[PDB]
Design an enzyme around this catalytic site. Structure first.
Site, short mmCIF file in Angstrom:
data_model
loop_
_atom_site.label_atom_id
_atom_site.label_comp_id
_atom_site.label_asym_id
_atom_site.label_seq_id
_atom_site.Cartn_x
_atom_site.Cartn_y
_atom_site.Cartn_z
N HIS A 41 21.05 75.58 28.34
CA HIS A 41 20.71 76.09 27.00
C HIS A 41 20.52 77.61 26.97
CE1 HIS A 41 16.32 75.99 27.97
NE2 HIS A 41 16.25 76.96 27.05
N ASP A 89 20.46 69.83 31.41
CA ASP A 89 20.26 71.24 31.12
C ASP A 89 20.38 72.09 32.35
OD1 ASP A 89 19.73 73.50 29.62
OD2 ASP A 89 17.59 73.09 29.39
N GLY A 183 11.09 82.19 27.93
CA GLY A 183 11.59 83.27 28.77
C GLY A 183 11.69 82.83 30.23
N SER A 185 12.63 79.65 31.08
CA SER A 185 13.68 78.66 31.20
C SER A 185 14.82 79.11 32.06
CB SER A 185 14.26 78.28 29.85
OG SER A 185 13.27 77.80 28.97
N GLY A 186 15.36 78.17 32.84
CA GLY A 186 16.46 78.46 33.74
C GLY A 186 16.03 78.85 35.12
C1 7GQ Z 1 14.98 67.07 21.08
C2 7GQ Z 1 14.15 68.07 21.80
N1 7GQ Z 1 13.89 67.95 23.15
C3 7GQ Z 1 13.22 69.06 23.37
N2 7GQ Z 1 13.05 69.78 22.25
C4 7GQ Z 1 12.34 71.00 22.01
C5 7GQ Z 1 11.56 71.12 20.86
C6 7GQ Z 1 10.85 72.28 20.61
C7 7GQ Z 1 10.90 73.36 21.48
C8 7GQ Z 1 10.17 74.61 21.11
O1 7GQ Z 1 10.37 75.15 20.02
N3 7GQ Z 1 9.28 75.09 22.00
C9 7GQ Z 1 8.52 76.31 21.79
C10 7GQ Z 1 9.39 77.56 21.67
C11 7GQ Z 1 8.33 78.67 21.76
C12 7GQ Z 1 7.27 78.11 22.75
C13 7GQ Z 1 7.74 76.68 23.06
N4 7GQ Z 1 8.86 77.07 23.92
C14 7GQ Z 1 8.97 76.94 25.32
N5 7GQ Z 1 10.12 77.39 25.84
C15 7GQ Z 1 10.27 77.28 27.17
C16 7GQ Z 1 9.36 76.73 28.08
CL1 7GQ Z 1 9.77 76.64 29.77
C17 7GQ Z 1 8.14 76.26 27.56
C18 7GQ Z 1 6.90 75.61 27.96
N6 7GQ Z 1 6.61 75.10 29.16
N7 7GQ Z 1 6.11 75.44 26.93
O2 7GQ Z 1 6.79 75.90 25.77
C19 7GQ Z 1 7.99 76.39 26.17
C20 7GQ Z 1 9.96 77.68 23.08
C21 7GQ Z 1 11.70 73.24 22.62
CL2 7GQ Z 1 11.94 74.61 23.68
C22 7GQ Z 1 12.41 72.08 22.90
N8 7GQ Z 1 13.66 69.13 21.21
#
Ligand code: 7GQ
Ligand code: NA
Lengths: 235, 55
Positions: A41, A89, A183, A185-186
């Site tokens: 991603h 991913d 940030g 991720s990956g």
């Molecule tokens: C269907 C599906 N499966 C996973 N989904 C999903 C749903 C929502 C989010 C999302 O918006 N997450 C928020 C957005 C800002 C902070 C949270 N976020 C994160 N990104 C990377 C990481 Cl590594 C984390 C973490 N450990 N907590 O939150 C993380 C990105 C994410 Cl990254 C993934 N949606």
């Protein structure tokens, strides 16, 4: 990484950072001198990516950094962002010119499928990255690291409304305050085996960084070992 | 009492069960199996997964 500590220079010499329209948008890990492994991603749009190995402080130009351009992106053959941005991913990045391996630029070890899974079962890995240091907070300048324990499957399923497949695992703390974040991720989840680190996961996603009752979600590398070794083979 | 399921056969990295209740240890790329038959020694200048900068 929320609740982590500053790495010392060369403490995670397999870590890379991915830079684009914004800096430190994702992490990665060195497989060999020509190949990086990351989350699919992070690299779906096919826009230009700069990889920096030997990085420490992303706002200071130092001397161990090795910048390379990505010439090819190989998302896993089962990745399909149109269905699910976070299933399978994982992706490989081919560099334009080889990294020069040294004490600051060193590959992560990758065991076979069976041992990568045994090492994840040890229950404790290290994650690292330049992601946010608080939920919705600033990115790190100095590389951060954190030891995260493996969380049992049933506990993780109850923690989120989204589906967690068997190719993913959860890690982190019941009390919150310590997690990966946007940030990161990956980047790598690694398990130390008698002083040698092995790649056990890819940092993938989460919902609210370090919130009590939420966990970081990771891709199990064991499922993709054979594909990594085949695609990145130099001999 | 020498099997890969007991303390990894005393192998530092990988273990394989072998004939006559023995084990064969091994290591990842860039390491060699040491003379003690258990440990993994670097066989290249910058082996994977090793921290070499003074901490
Ligand atoms: C269907 C599906 N499966 C996973 N989904 C999903 C749903 C929502 C989010 C999302 O918006 N997450 C928020 C957005 C800002 C902070 C949270 N976020 C994160 N990104 C990377 C990481 Cl590594 C984390 C973490 N450990 N907590 O939150 C993380 C990105 C994410 Cl990254 C993934 N949606
Ligand atoms: Na720097």
């Amino acid at each position: 990484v929320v609740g982590g500590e500053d790495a010392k220079p060369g403490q995670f010499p397999w870590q890379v950072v991915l830079n684009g329209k914004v800096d430190a948008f994702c992490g990665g890990s060195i497989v060999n001198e020509k190949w990086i492994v990351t989350a699919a991603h992070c690299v779906e749009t096919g826009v230009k990516i700069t990889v920096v190995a030997g990085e420490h402080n992303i706002e200071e130009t130092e001397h161990t950094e090795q910048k390379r351009n990505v010439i090819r992106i190989i998302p896993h053959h089962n990745y399909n962002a149109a269905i699910n941005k976070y299933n399978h991913d994982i992706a490989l990045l081919e560099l334009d010119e080889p990294l020069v391996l040294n004490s600051y630029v060193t590959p992560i070890c990758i065991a076979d499928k069976e041992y990568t899974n045994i090492f994840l079962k040890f229950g404790s890995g290290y994650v690292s990255g330049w992601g946010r240091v608080f939920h919705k907070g600033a990115s790190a300048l100095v590389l951060q690291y954190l030891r995260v324990p493996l969380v049992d499957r049933a506990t993780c399923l109850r923690s989120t409304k989204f589906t967690i497949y068997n190719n993913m695992f959860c890690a982190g703390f019941h009390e919150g305050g310590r997690d990966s974040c946007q940030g990161d991720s990956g980047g790598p989840h690694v398990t130390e085996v008698e002083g040698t680190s092995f790649l056990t996961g890819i940092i993938s996603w989460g919902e609210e960084c370090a919130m009590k009752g939420k966990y970081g979600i990771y891709t199990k590398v064991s499922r993709y070992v054979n594909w990594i070794k085949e695609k990145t083979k130099l001999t | 009492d020498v099997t890969c399921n007991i303390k990894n056969g005393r192998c530092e990295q990988f273990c394989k069960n072998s004939a006559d209740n023995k084990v064969v240890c091994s290591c990842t790329e860039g390491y060699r199996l040491a003379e003690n038959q258990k440990s993994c020694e670097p066989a290249v200048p910058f082996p994977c997964g090793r921290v070499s900068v003074s901490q």
